[PDB]
């Protein structure tokens, strides 16, 4: 049962940035539903329609799809939103789309929860999305921190523990990330040994692999050895792979060989 | 490979031993036709030619740069 706007109140705010889904255009413009705030219809007049001059109303609208938008006035007595699209900075259009994406992902998760439990989605949002969005600024960061930290649910009152379990499962399977950090070390050794040296550097670099974040350095070439890690927080890998570099340098500088670095640790 | 062809008009497939704007300057005069050097999102080279003159651009690369003259395919269209 799809209801319950993402944000705090049913009434959208003034001058806010939104993402509008189009349904119907007769003569005055496009009075369309909203998928960032509540579904109260916002009306767009032809004057605020086109950045260019409107040439064919059929082409530029593309009914049934979302477009970036702004709201000028909100009728807070029964519901009449005045809305526009041309008066938006070109820099914030992508950010509006990102906010639409975040809301749509959160609502897909919570709609799955509601349709599985037959619980009104307003109940779920008032017990799940609103407290989390308050605690962490946004429900998306709340779910991401739920993935790493299970304490984000503490201080919150679920309607049922089954909701907690199924929601956590769907997050852990749908929001599962963790960016690969990859680098390439060159072996320039003209030296006496150098397979036992690489073996020893391999041992002292693979032992460093922690439980949550393992550094497995594969072989693709004799000189070019690859350094691949799954950076959960995207900041441990830089120092881990710097440690790998210092280890390989310490191994090489005493046995007789020489090595340099081709590709430094990059996300 | 190095497949060169003309599609109703445009020439797609162009080795770049000579400059493409120089290609426009050596096409536009003799052919007298409008030509647009458009960079599509990462296909081969695109050069326009208004009016169907496929044999004329055959004559052209014969004159300027054509050295194989066998993989150039005259499309039906």
């Amino acid at each position: 049962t799809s209801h319950c706007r993402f944000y705090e109140n049913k009434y959208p705010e003034i001058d806010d940035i939104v993402m509008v889904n189009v349904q119907q255009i007769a003569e005055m413009g496009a009075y369309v539903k909203l998928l960032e705030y509540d579904n109260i219809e916002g009306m767009i007049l032809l004057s605020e329609l086109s950045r260019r001059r409107i040439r064919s109303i059929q082409k530029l609208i593309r009914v049934g799809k979302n477009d970036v938008a702004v709201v000028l006035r909100v009728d807070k007595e029964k519901g009449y939103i005045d809305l526009s699209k041309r008066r938006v900075s070109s820099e914030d259009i992508i950010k509006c789309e990102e906010k639409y994406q975040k809301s749509k992902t959160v609502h897909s998760i919570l709609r799955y929860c509601a349709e599985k439990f037959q619980i009104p989605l307003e109940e779920l949002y008032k017990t799940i999305a609103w407290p989390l969005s308050r605690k962490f600024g946004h429900a998306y960061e709340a779910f991401k921190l739920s993935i790493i930290d299970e304490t984000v649910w503490e201080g919150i009152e679920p309607p049922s523990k089954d909701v907690l379990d199924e929601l956590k499962n769907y997050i852990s399977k749908r929001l599962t990330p963790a960016v690969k950090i990859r680098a390439d070390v060159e072996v320039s050794c003209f030296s006496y040994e150098g397979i036992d040296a690489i073996k020893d550097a391999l041992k002292s670099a693979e032992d460093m692999s922690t439980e949550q974040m393992q550094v497995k350095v594969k072989l693709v070439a004799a000189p070019l050895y690859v350094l691949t890690t799954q950076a959960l927080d995207k900041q441990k890998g830089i120092e881990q792979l710097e440690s790998a570099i210092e280890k390989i340098t310490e191994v090489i500088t005493k046995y007789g060989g020489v090595c340099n670095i081709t590709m430094p640790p990059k996300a | 490979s190095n497949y060169i062809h003309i599609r109703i008009t445009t020439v797609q497939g162009v080795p770049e031993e000579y400059d493409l704007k120089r290609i426009l300057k050596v096409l536009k005069k003799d052919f007298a036709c409008n030509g647009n050097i458009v960079k599509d999102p990462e296909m081969g080279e695109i050069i326009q030619l208004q009016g169907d003159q496929r044999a004329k651009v055959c004559e052209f690369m014969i004159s300027q740069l054509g050295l194989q003259k066998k993989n150039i395919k005259i499309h039906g269209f």
């Binding site: 003209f190 006496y192 040994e193 690489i198 594969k218 072989l219 693709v220 070439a221 004799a222 000189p223 | -």
Partner: protein
Amino acid sequence: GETEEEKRKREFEEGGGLPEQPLNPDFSKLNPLSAEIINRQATINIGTIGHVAHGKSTVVRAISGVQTVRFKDELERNITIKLGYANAKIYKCQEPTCPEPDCYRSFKSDKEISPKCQRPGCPGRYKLVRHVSFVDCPGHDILMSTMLSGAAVMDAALLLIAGNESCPQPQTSEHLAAIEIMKLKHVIILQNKVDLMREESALEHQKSILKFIRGTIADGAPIVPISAQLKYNIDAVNEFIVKTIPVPPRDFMISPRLIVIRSFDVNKPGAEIEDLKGGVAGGSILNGVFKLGDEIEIRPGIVTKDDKGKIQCKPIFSNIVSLFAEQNDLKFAVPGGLIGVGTKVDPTLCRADRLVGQVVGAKGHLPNIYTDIEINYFLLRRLLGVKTDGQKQAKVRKLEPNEVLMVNIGSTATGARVVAVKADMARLQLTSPACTEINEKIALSRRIEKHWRLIGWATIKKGTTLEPIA
């Protein structure tokens, strides 16, 4: 209802399999034709020479069945830089009834010590007369240094001539001259194309070839028609190899050495580095016996430049972990065979083209790296490898001081600067490290027509030593 693999396994076990080399056999009695040496290692190196766009790897593949790679995408089709290898076993029928020409049968490396004869009607088997190694050499006008190195490694020659093109092709003449330079006379001439030809065209081409080889060093060189595509008349080539080419004097008295022509790294990608292998230098042993677990140093080795422009040579000591020969890991090595020494030398030192023509000596010897060498040179009249369009094939001029000329000392490919010019002798200044052990056969090439072109032969007489930095 036996599977073909099962029948082959039965024939392999019936044929005695392949007995393993003794860990410590008596060497003062071992001969290159001994059973233990012959079963799992080649004793004679046979190289092939020919002109471009003719096919040498095809003939080697037809003779043996061991493929020659032809790698590097671009080189998969046109020309190869590194040499080609292939192991063939000479098997001769023990039965007198069958005709001599088809008695011999050349098999590939992992065949048993006695396979069954494929001729219909002979219940006899084959006996291993000799195991032969094949060193395919490039025959393009650009790649000569590798061909000269492999011909220095080479001990027996197979010249390939095709008929339908021009009778006096220059590339084969150049390769024959190079072979004549480095003390090698056992040359077998082979007709590449006979099928598409008429019965008199072949005779005319044969008359032309005989006319060609009358004043060169080789005189009694046999000529044999062969096919690379139809795969016929290979047993006759095997018989000619057995008859014409004996074993060059190679006993166990002379000191051990190694001449690496190819560098191979063993790093299988995708597998975790926990289980890896040492680096392999592909080298020929022409003098000495090498055993598992030996200490060895690459003599020219680490070439480095100091801040003052001086060239420092660091010999590359290393312990031999394995000596891969033919098909299986072996315990002892036989001189006169291309063997891969898999040592603990760092795999990046054997990556692409680092040990291409480098001398290596076992611990217990002191080779000499030289910076300035004294050379005795002898020239030829007409430059070989050029088709002059009807005017006097180019006459080689005398050398001039301070010219970078390619002086292929055996396998080492270096560009030396001439410091002194006289009637027979010359001082060569080497920017790249080169070493001398006893004599070393050397080829000389100049730059007259872009690419390198052979002029004559050379022998080191003296040199300025560089004392190793320990």
